[PDB]
Structures are given as C-alpha cells and as structure tokens.
Amino acid sequence: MNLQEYQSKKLMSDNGVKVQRFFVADTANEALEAAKRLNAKEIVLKAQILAGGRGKGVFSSGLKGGVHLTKDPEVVGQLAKQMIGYNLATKQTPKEGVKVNKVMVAEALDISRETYLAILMDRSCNGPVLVGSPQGGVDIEEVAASNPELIFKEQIDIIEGIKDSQAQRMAENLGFLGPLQNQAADQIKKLYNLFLKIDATQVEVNPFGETPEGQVVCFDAKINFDDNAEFRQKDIFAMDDKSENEPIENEAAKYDLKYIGLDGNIACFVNGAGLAMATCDIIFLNGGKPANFLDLGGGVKESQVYQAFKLLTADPKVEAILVNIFGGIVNCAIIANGITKACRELELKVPLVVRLEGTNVHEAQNILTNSGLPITSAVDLEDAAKKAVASVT
C-alpha cells in the first residue's frame, strides 16, 4: 500500500501536520490555473509518481527533472505540459519509467533548517520510537554511519503516549529554538498521533524544517501503512491505486496469492512464506535463477492453484515451474488432482517439477505420474531444485 505525495500530504494536513499549501492537477491548464490561484512568491511543480528520485529524473517528452521551481505561473503550465501523460524514469523506477497523470502545484517555501524525524515501531524496542537528527536532507542510514552521535532517540510508551517533555527534548535536539521549539514539539506530538491513527508502521519526515519566516514545516514525508490494519483503515486503503505495482502482483493479490517477482526464469509455487523463500533460495544454490516468490497462503482453493498457474505461465520469461507443497493437513493426491486439473485446463506447455510431501505422497506422485503433461515428480527439495535447473539448461 502506497500513497502519492499529494495523498499523504493531505492526510497529514487533515491531522494537524503542517505542510505546504498545494493544488493537484490533471492537465497543464489546470496546473497553470493552480499556480495562479496559489498566489505565492514562488511555486514548485512536482510530478506525482510513487518511486523516489523524481528530482533527478527524466520524462519521455525531453524534460529533465521531476521537480521544478518558478514564480511564473506560466512556466508551471508549460512545464506541466511536458510532464502530464509522459513517463518519468528515475533511479528508482524501471527502464521505461512511470506514467505521470497528475502533478502537484504547491507553494515553494524557503528552508533555513533541515532536520530528520521519523516515528516507527522498533522491533528492537517493542513500542514506538522517535528518531530525529539535526542533519536533515539526507538518507538516514547515511547519517547513522557518518555521524552516529547526531542521531537522537526517544522511546515512547505506547500506553502513556508521547510526553510533552519528549517532544520538547527531541525538538531541542533537532535544533529548534524559542517559539520554534514549541512548534516543533507540537508538530511532533501531532505526527505521533497521526502515526497511531492511520496504523503506520512508519512516518518519515525529511526534511522536517523551518522557514526563515518562522514556520516549522514537514516539507516531504513518506508513510508506510501496516497491511494488517486495512480492515480498520478502509478509506486510506481505498486511496491505494496500484497503478505502479508490478501487474502480475495485482493480479495475484486478486486471489489472495502473495506474489513477488524476481528476474530469474524458473517460477515457484509454494505454500508457506518460509518454505517459499527457501525454495527460491535452493533453486539459486543449484545454479538456477528463480523468477518469483509465490506463497499460496493456506486456504488453497482449486481456483487458486489455477490462478497461481495462470500467472506463472502468462509470464513470457518463465521456462519451468517448481511446485513445492507440504501437505500435512490435506492429502497430496487431492493436491495432485487440482494440479493436474488446472494444468490440463491451462494446457500448461512449460515443464513442471512437482515436489509434494505430507500425506499420501506415494499415490499423489502416481496421480501426478499418470498425466502426460510436462510434469515431473521430485523426491525431496534438493532433487526438485536440481531438476528445475536441468529443465532450463
């Protein structure tokens, strides 16, 4: 689940978090009008895509850069025309780039102080953690390696809430002074509360700064949502478009299939996330290149064995399939039947190596073995992997 800059900045502003004033626009004229109506000394036009790196990006129109500053509303309309409906590639997008359908027109504010401030649940601490640094504008991992003493932490007690004194102490360590310290401390309490409210696993503000004119502003920010809180975060999840998600992945999710594409050519189909990762792994250890991680989950319906397959075959790059299922509960001959039924109805034409373990394995490899579809049976996981690799050599 990801939100576009305009969506998250709105969500933040709606919760008392100070952010730049902005308009969103679908066309260049709307962008020109946005800029006029903004009525600001200076304006920033920013292509709206999920991938980071926009500022150092390029558009398929010829325009260099996804983020631009100007005072002339006119230039904003012109620049917008070179962005809308074009593709923007950055260091974080794929080759062909990503379609831009919207741009943000916002008041560009000057920045006197740049600081880092995030809230996340640290797995090490058990409980919310406030992480800040006076050295903002920079990749946090970096500041940690460079100047680890410039990193400040406040362990928040989830049951009490963040204390005024924690917000103040952090506000002061970030470098804020006088009334700005009180503002920063407040923005911080508000960011923490927003963090709890939308079920974020993390809210990262960078730069968390101040204008020469006296305002503490969250200039840019990134929010990660906890997928398990979706049933209580409907509205926020509805704003997820998925337009930037790998196609096979949206398709797989449609069937409660957890698919993660890799670039290899041997595809996997497994039940159990640990076993899935391990299968992608054992394939690699035997000189193969896994094409994907796919965890069928547990409630494996025939229809899902079907879609699971439909999604691996449809992939041009797939040259073989390693199915690794540990039966336990259900007995393998059943599983084997659904595998055959789907592969038949799909006319699977790529070789399939099937590793079935659990109950009735013998018969199940018979039911499999009685088919005449490019299905091959493996005795153990190492055998399965070696066979899938032999298959594409």
Partner 1 sequence: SYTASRKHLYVDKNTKVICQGFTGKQGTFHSQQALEYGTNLVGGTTPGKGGKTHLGLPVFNTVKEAKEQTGATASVIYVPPPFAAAAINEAIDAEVPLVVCITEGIPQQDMVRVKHRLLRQGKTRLIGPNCPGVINPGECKIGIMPGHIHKKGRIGIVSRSGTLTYEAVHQTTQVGLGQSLCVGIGGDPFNGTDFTDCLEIFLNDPATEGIILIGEIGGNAEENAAEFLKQHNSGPKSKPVVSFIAGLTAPPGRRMGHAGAIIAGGKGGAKEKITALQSAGVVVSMSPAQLGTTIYKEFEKRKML
User: Interface residues with partner 1 (CB under 8 A)?
Assistant: 121, 123-124, 126-128, 140-141, 157-159, 196, 199, 201, 226-229, 231-232, 258, 260, 262, 270-285, 290, 293, 295, 326-329, 357-359, 380-382, 385
Q: Catalytic pick from 154, 204, 210, 319?
A: 204
Q: According to the annotation, is 215 in a ligand binding site? A: no
3-state secondary structure of 381: helix
Strand partners, 70: 43
Which among 380, 368, 379, 373 is positioned nearest to 346, based on CA atoms? 373
| Closest distance of CB 179 from partner 1, Å | 33
169 is in an annotated binding site: no
Q: Least distance to partner 1 from the beta carbon of 149, Å? A: 19
Length of the chain: 393
* Residue 171 or 270 with smaller CB distance to partner 1: 270
- According to DSSP, the residues that pair with 356 across neighbouring strands are 325
Catalytic (active site) residue 116 = yes
Fill in the DSSP letter of residue 105.
E
Q: Which are the residues after which the chain is interrupted (C to N > 2.5 Å)?
A: none
Token match 């310290």: residue? 181
Q: Which is nearer to partner 1, 124 or 393 (CB)?
A: 124
According to the annotation, is 52 in a ligand binding site? no
Distance of CA 39 to the CA centre of its chain: 35
H helix or E strand, kind and range, residue 185? helix 178-197
Task: Give the residue with the Cβ less far from partner 1, 270 or 352.
Answer: 270
**Closer of 69 and 158 to partner 1 (Cβ):** 158
Flag whether 130 is marked binding: no
| In the complex, least distance from residue 357 CB atom to partner 1, rounded to whole angstroms | 6
Give the shortest CB-123-to-partner 1 separation in angstroms: 5
Q: Which two tokens stand for residue 238?
A: 């509805």
Q: Are strands 98-99 and 87-89 parallel, antiparallel or unpaired?
A: antiparallel
Residue with Cβ nearer partner 1 (64 or 317): 317
Q: How far is the CB of 243 from partner 1 (least distance, A)?
A: 18
Is 329 flagged in the annotation as binding? yes
Closest approach of partner 1 to the CB of residue 34, in Å:
33
Beta-ladder partners of 292: 261
For residue 138, give the DSSP letter. S
Q: 6, 86, 116, 192: which one is catalytic?
A: 116
Smallest gap from Cβ 32 to partner 1, in A, equals: 37
Nearer to partner 1, 179 or 287 (CB): 287
Query: 81 vs 258, which CB is nearer to partner 1?
Result: 258
- Determine if residue 127 is left, alpha or beta; phi over 0 gives left, psi from -120 to 50 gives alpha, anything else beta: left
Left, alpha or beta for 218 (phi > 0: left; psi -120 to 50: alpha)?
beta
Q: Give me the phi and psi of 372, to 5 degrees please.
A: 75, 35
Half-sphere exposure of 322 (CA within 13 A, CB side): 38
Q: In this structure, what token pair is assigned to residue 50?
A: 């999920």
User: Per the annotation, does 54 bind a ligand?
Assistant: yes
Residue 206 known to bind ligand: yes
Of 233, 207, 234, the C-alpha closest to 218 is: 207
Tokens encoding 343: 């592969």
Going by the annotation, the residues of the binding site are: 20, 53-55, 109, 206, 220, 271, 328-330
Going by the annotation, the residues of the binding site for Mg(2+) are: 206, 220
Going by the annotation, the residues of the binding site for GTP are: 20, 53-55, 109
Residues belonging to the active site: 116, 204
